[PDB]
Amino acid sequence: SMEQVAMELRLTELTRLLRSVLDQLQDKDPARIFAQPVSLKEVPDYLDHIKHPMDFATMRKRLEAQGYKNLHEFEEDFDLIIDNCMKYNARDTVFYRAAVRLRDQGGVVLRQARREVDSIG
Numbered sequence: 846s847m848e849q850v851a852m853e854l855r856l857t858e859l860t861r862l863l864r865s866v867l868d869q870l871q872d873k874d875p876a877r878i879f880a881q882p883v884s885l886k887e888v889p890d891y892l893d894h895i896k897h898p899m900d901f902a903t904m905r906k907r908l909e910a911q912g913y914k915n916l917h918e919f920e921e922d923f924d925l926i927i928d929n930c931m932k933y934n935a936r937d938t939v940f941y942r943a944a945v946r947l948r949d950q951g952g953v954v955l956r957q958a959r960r961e962v963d964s965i966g
């Protein structure tokens with residue numbers, strides 16, 4: 846139907862917007878600490894600790910399949926990256942601190958993205 850096409854056009858431009866957002870958020874991780882899933886070969890006990898792993902590569906895969914229906918779904922995944930890290934790693938580690946900095950610096954980006962998604966519809 847025409848309605849379905851219209852819907853798919855909105856999804857496509859949402860995906861376009863979120864691609865930009867994801868790029869800006871990943872720029873705030875210059876150490877690439879969150880770039881790839883935590884290796885279960887190198888960290889064998891990880892899944893005993895973290896029940897829903899997430900990372901930028903995995904988000905990007907979902908993104909390009911147009912798998913984020915709205916900004917909330919995207920933000921959930923971003924928050925998993927940060928929250929998993931702040932639980933698995935202690936406060937005095939480069940990993941925990943990178944998560945804090947990513948959350949802080951990311952807030953600006955996400956604040957504007959929400960306004961753009963709302964405004965553009």
Ligand SMILES: COc1ccc(CNC(C)=O)cc1
Nearest residue numbers: 878879883887888930933940
């Ligand atoms: C192989 O060495 C490692 C692997 C993972 C981590 C923690 N990373 C995250 C995102 O939690 C630390 C050391």
